[PDB]
Paper text:
Introduction of a biotinylated monophosphine palladium complex within streptavidin affords an enantioselective artificial Suzukiase. ArMs result from the incorporation of an abiotic cofactor within a macromolecule (protein or oligonucleotide). In summary, incorporation of an electron-rich phosphino–palladium moiety within Sav affords an artificial Suzukiase for the synthesis of enantioenriched binaphthyls (up to 90% ee and 50 TONs for 2-methoxy-binaphthyl 8b).
To gain structural insight on the second coordination sphere around the Pd moiety, crystals of Sav S112Y–K121E were grown and soaked with a solution of 1 in DMSO (for details, see ESI†). The Pd atom was unambiguously assigned as a strong peak in the difference map (12σ) with a corresponding peak in the anomalous difference map (8σ). The density map clearly highlights the presence of the phosphine ligand, the palladium, and the chloride (see ESI Fig. S5†). The palladium atoms of two symmetry related-cofactors (face-to-face) are separated by 11.7 Å. The palladium was found in the vicinity of the O atoms of S112Y and K121E (Pd···O distance 6.4 Å and 7.1 Å respectively). Inspection of the X-ray structure of the active site of 1·S112Y–K121E shows that the Pd-phosphine ligand is effectively “locked” into place by the steric environment of the Sav protein, which is evidenced by the discrete atomic position of the Pd and P and their relatively low B-factors despite proximity to the solvent pocket. Furthermore, the conformation of Y112 is effectively locked in place by an H-bonding interaction of the sidechain oxygen with the backbone carbonyl of E121 (distance 2.88 Å), which would not be the case with the similarly large S112W mutation (entry 18).
Numbering used by the authors:
A (entry chain A), D (entry chain A): 13 to 133
B (entry chain B), C (entry chain B): 13 to 134
Amino acid sequence: DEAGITGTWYNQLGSTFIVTAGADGALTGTYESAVGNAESRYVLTGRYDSAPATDGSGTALGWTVAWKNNYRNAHSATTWSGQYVGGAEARINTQWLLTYGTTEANAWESTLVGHDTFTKV
Amino acid sequence: DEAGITGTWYNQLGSTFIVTAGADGALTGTYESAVGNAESRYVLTGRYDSAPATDGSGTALGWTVAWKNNYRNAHSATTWSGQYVGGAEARINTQWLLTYGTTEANAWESTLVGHDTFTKVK
Amino acid sequence: DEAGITGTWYNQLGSTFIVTAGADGALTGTYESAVGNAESRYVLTGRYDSAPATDGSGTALGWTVAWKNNYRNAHSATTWSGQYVGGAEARINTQWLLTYGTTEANAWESTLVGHDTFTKVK
Amino acid sequence: DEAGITGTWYNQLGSTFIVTAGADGALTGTYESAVGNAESRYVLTGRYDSAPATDGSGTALGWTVAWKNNYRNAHSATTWSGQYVGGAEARINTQWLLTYGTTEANAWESTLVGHDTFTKV
Ligand SMILES: [Cl-]
Ligand SMILES: [Cl-]
Ligand SMILES: [Cl-]
Ligand SMILES: [Cl-]
């Protein structure tokens, strides 16, 4: 649980996700994107189910990155929603929503959707 | 900004979203859902753009709730992604993803998607 | 059902959706978008459940528009997925995915998601 | 274009997608799901960009299946939105929305989202 999730993760684009899972269900850490208007690390914070079912199911979790740090601001935020799966091939499988700030007129085009799979590599 | 976002919000389902926005970009608070396998408040945490553009654009933000508290655990988590819009009729417009724990064979059906609009008045 | 769905619909952006529902479950018509890189009508095609439950549940449906017509080509396509709800205030509530052609390096940013609500009155 | 898309496709779950692309941008065919409340083939219909950019970009397309056929009805419909990518490893990369009919009270839980990658295998 806590131990399985804590540590470094990499996704299929080469991005780096460093996270600490608290016994209380907290996720905290940093994210570094291999793509987009991003450089160096960004703060992340999220939550995970700290007492998952014991029927073979994954562990639900989610986190957010606002794409502002000391280097740049891309006026956007991404949330990843998914589940942690344990085993020899531990994975965090996610889908994500990236919203950027828009005028109300352009609200219809404010949100991208995609999917990331993270491995300990 | 920080002052605009902090406080109590309500969505179209009758859910209650209570949040404090930090100067650093943090969001912290609690969420109470009017629907689903949920009761009472749940911890939420997230992030918002603490230095948005000044061109009339909204403020990007997101937050997460894991649906476990001292009363219930629905083995699932929702992330809201959207933007805060100031002015007279302040709103937070979001789309969300709800993932629940599944077996690997059932992963394809693990995630719901929807949209919530939050305002300051009941 | 077939009679309820067939005809002209309007969404919250001012777009116009004209559709014919077939007895077999087919949807055929045209879409005119009030926003984006689009002008005039575009062909749409899709499917709906021609034998829905009779328990008060909505009618599932979906359709696709590729944003090429005789005037413009925006190298993109939108799919709407949702349900038709009958009764006095008939609506089609949808969420949509818009994908545009990208290079492989840019695929991660190829798809927008949103929601449209269609009604019969302007 | 037309030739690249037409034919049989398989996704990562083992589902089978048989499609004919028309010169006019039409997609027609059948879908057979390896999972869910589904058996045998279902009608599909969709659209694709019949004159894509020539800058290396993929070909945008989308299609719908309503999960009713002569065998069963699952009171739901899935739309796939994505792009066709040519080459030695031709792929149709998609994201999808599955909506099932619900009461208005339960509308909030009516729609699933996911992703499918199709190959000619
Ligand atoms: Cl069992
Ligand atoms: Cl104004
Ligand atoms: Cl009623
Ligand atoms: Cl160039």
